[PDB]
Design a protein around this ligand. Sequence first.
Ligand code: NBB
Ligand code: NBB
Ligand code: NBB
Ligand code: CL
Ligand code: CL
Ligand code: CL
Ligand code: MG
Lengths: 115, 117
Amino acid sequence: VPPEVFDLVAEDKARCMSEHGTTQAQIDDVDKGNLVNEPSITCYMYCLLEAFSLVDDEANVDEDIMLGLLPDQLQERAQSVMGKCLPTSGSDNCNKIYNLAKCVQESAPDVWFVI
Amino acid sequence: DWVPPEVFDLVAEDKARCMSEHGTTQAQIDDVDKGNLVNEPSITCYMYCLLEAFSLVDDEANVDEDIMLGLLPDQLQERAQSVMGKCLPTSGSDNCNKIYNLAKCVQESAPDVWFVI
Ligand SMILES: CCCCNS(=O)(=O)c1ccccc1
Ligand SMILES: CCCCNS(=O)(=O)c1ccccc1
Ligand SMILES: CCCCNS(=O)(=O)c1ccccc1
Ligand SMILES: [Cl-]
Ligand SMILES: [Cl-]
Ligand SMILES: [Cl-]
Ligand SMILES: [Mg+2]
């Protein structure tokens, strides 16, 4: 019998949504580049980054792992955005990630990367 | 003021890039997605490329089990820990063959479980 196939990204998103009461409409908003400082979505964003080892349990970004998501041709651009936007800051892990996302959006308004 | 950005799905972009860079056909990707592998670089270096794009392995065939375990779902954690304990570290004739052998080891150990981007 063929194996059951598990879509890792779908699973990780599902788990993070369920942990924070996040709706599909909210995740679809973030996917369009529309950001709001509302914990039900910003805590989802933190959860998902943490699942990918992009941040630790205090929402500090692991720059090597974050740069590691991108192709070689985008490394210099990404390094420049990380120079403007790291280290993270904010009142809690979720607000740290809201502030990061806003900084990344404003620093590179032409493009928006999503998992 | 906000302007709509061009949105890029990392997974979609990574698959398109990796396909191009390794000569992989759509049929071959479809086979990978169903768990059917062959020890041909157009397949195995494509799989390597997708893993590397999420830091699951370096450019020297070293797999990071801690990053991997974080991505797997809760209900597979115990099985995944056991399977990866059995199948790591990698071994093989070259970078891409190491990933072929890893995939085959995981499939032998857990024939009912296959994970995809
Ligand atoms: C860059 C800051 C925005 C993060 N958005 S995200 O949480 O959906 C996410 C995107 C990509 C990988 C993991 C999580
Ligand atoms: C030039 C394109 C902007 C780069 N954005 S980013 O570095 O914040 C980034 C976003 C999501 C994942 C990894 C890095
Ligand atoms: C056992 C080795 C995994 C191979 N599967 S995959 O190439 O689709 C893949 C899964 C997860 C992330 C990236 C690529
Ligand atoms: Cl940081
Ligand atoms: Cl702070
Ligand atoms: Cl895309
Ligand atoms: Mg890399």
